[PDB]
């Protein structure tokens, strides 16, 4: 049996990340790893400059609208004043090039396209832009995005929808339906969860090949060394980010097992490295013109991953600024700053349809309350710092500066910069995950811990 390449188009504030576990699920099922292609683009210019089209009644922009608030007036003016048409020629061109180099390197003739959130809106404009394009497409998958339109002409369509409750920005929907297509609904999944979900990988595999797949678990591959091919790129705009990568292996408490790194390298966007399967690692990144030190943490690589993404904070959506006032008080040398990420909504409020709530333990305190991670917010990024630098942990006063940010939320917690910190998460879909890392100083360090979208319960 033979597979055809797949291209993945992220949604607003998204990236290849949302399709990293999917790329590995396809891998263990035969798919040669280098076939799962991700297409990244400027989610901020797209939603602002294109999706404010009347083509879907301005329905795609909704999300770029809110997130743009943080933009500097001069720079936002610059953005909107870009030519709507040229940015679509340019961009859809880069997608052609990408799809070609696909068929070409694989020998197949048709490819399968996947779209998520604003990304669905993207794909559709694309497949309907001409015949020659709709020609090079085998099947089309539209994850929890556009609805209320007819699927492209003569091209097998698949559209999956999650619980709308966790997606305010799309509104009053009685039934999400992409006409004449195969519709699948998981009313027990939230927006991004549904993109990285295993239960959603199955439906995907079947619809594009013709048969359910062997497994949907992340399979630890034979061997001692895995190949990671990631990228340090700017949040939301996905531009390449320049810096220095130092890799230090560590023990169950974040302490470095070597005095020097096992890898130190110049990075300008993309990067490749060979690492030991199942080994804990700390990714220390120093971005250009920022004296801040970034400590990236996550679960070990049980197998080749060619879609790892490390998100950096850059202009125009310099999201790290909102935390700036604080990083600057002398209080900072006494607290630690954390960013908890999980491409699977961390819910703090119960909802029958959803089925549960997660718990995120930072130093014993659970920071995934009902007022910090309500479903509406669809929390994927979570900042944990000393709000105000008062040294007091008001966990009931929601940090307001994230009100507007899509997919984020924060929480006023004090995490002592002495010894270590302990993040422990009991996922709402069963399974705990836990990390213990050095408690770095908020004055010179930022800490990014990334939870795994997939988590097993070999007993439940
Ligand atoms: Cl605030």
TrEMBL record:
Outline the extent of the AB hydrolase-1 domain. Answer: 6-164
A Gene Ontology molecular-function term?
metal ion binding
Query: What keywords are annotated for this sequence in UniProt?
Result: Calcium, Metal-binding
Q: Which InterPro entries match?
A: AB_hydrolase_1, AB_hydrolase_fold, AF_1763-like_C, AFL_C
Which intervals hold domain AF-1763-like C-terminal? Answer: 339-453
Query: What Pfam families would the database entry show?
Result: Abhydrolase_6, AF_1763-like_C, Lipase_C
> Which parts of the sequence bind Mg(2+) 1?
139
Q: Which domain of life is it from?
A: Archaea
**Could you say which residues bind Mg(2+) 2 here?**
386-387, 390, 392, 412
AFL C-terminal domain span: 224-315
Residues reported in the UniProt entry to bind Ca(2+): 386-387, 390, 392, 412
- From the Swiss-Prot or TrEMBL record, give the protein name: Lipase, putative
């Amino acid at each position: 049996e033979d597979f055809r390449p797949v291209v993945f188009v992220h949604g607003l504030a998204g990236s290849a990340g949302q399709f990293e576990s999917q790329g590995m699920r396809f891998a263990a099922n035969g798919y040669p790893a280098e076939y799962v292609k991700t297409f990244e683009y400027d989610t901020i210019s797209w939603a602002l400059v294109v999706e404010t089209d009347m083509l879907f009644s301005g329905l795609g922009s909704e999300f770029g609208l809110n997130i743009s608030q943080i933009i500097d007036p001069e720079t936002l003016d610059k953005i909107l004043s870009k030519s709507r048409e040229r940015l679509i020629d340019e961009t859809f061109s880069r997608l052609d090039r990408v799809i070609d180099e696909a068929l070409a390197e694989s020998g197949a003739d048709k490819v399968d396209l996947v779209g998520h959130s604003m990304g669905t809106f993207f794909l559709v404009r694309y497949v309907n832009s001409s015949p020659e394009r709709a020609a090079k497409v085998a099947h089309l998958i539209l994850l929890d995005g556009v609805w209320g339109v007819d699927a492209p002409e003569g091209i097998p369509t698949l559209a999956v929808f999650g619980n709308p409750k966790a997606l305010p920005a799309l509104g009053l929907p009685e039934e999400k339906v992409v006409y004449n297509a195969t519709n699948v609904y998981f009313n027990n999944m939230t927006h991004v969860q549904l993109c990285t979900s295993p239960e959603t990988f199955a439906v995907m595999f079947e619809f594009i090949n013709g048969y359910k797949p062997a497994t949907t678990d992340i399979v630890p591959q034979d061997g001692d060394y895995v190949k990671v091919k990631g990228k340090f790129l700017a949040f939301a705009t996905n531009g390449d980010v320049s810096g220095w990568l130092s890799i230090y292996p560590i023990d169950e408490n974040g302490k470095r097992l070597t005095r020097l790194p096992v890898k130190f390298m110049r990075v300008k966007g993309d990067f490749e490295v060979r690492l030991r399967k199942g080994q804990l690692y700390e990714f220390q990144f120093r971005k250009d013109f920022s004296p801040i030190i970034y400590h990236y943490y996550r679960a070990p690589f049980v197998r080749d991953d060619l879609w790892a993404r490390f998100l950096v904070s850059k202009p125009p959506l310099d999201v790290e600024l909102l935390i700036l006032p604080e990083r600057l008080s002398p209080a900072a040398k006494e607290t630690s700053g954390l960013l908890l990420i999980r491409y699977k909504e961390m819910i703090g409020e119960y909802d029958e349809e959803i089925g549960g709530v997660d718990e995120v333990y930072v130093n014993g305190v659970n920071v995934c309350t009902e007022r910090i991670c309500p479903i509406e917010r669809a929390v994927n990024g979570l900042w944990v710092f000393d709000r105000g630098a008062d040294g007091k942990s008001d966990l009931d006063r929601e940090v307001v500066r994230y009100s507007i940010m899509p997919f984020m939320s924060a929480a006023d917690l004090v995490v002592p910069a002495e010894g270590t910190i302990s993040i422990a998460v009991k996922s709402r879909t069963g399974g705990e995950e836990s990390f213990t890392i050095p408690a770095w100083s908020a004055d010179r360090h930022s800490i990014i811990v990334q939870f795994s979208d997939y988590i097993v319960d070999k007993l439940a």
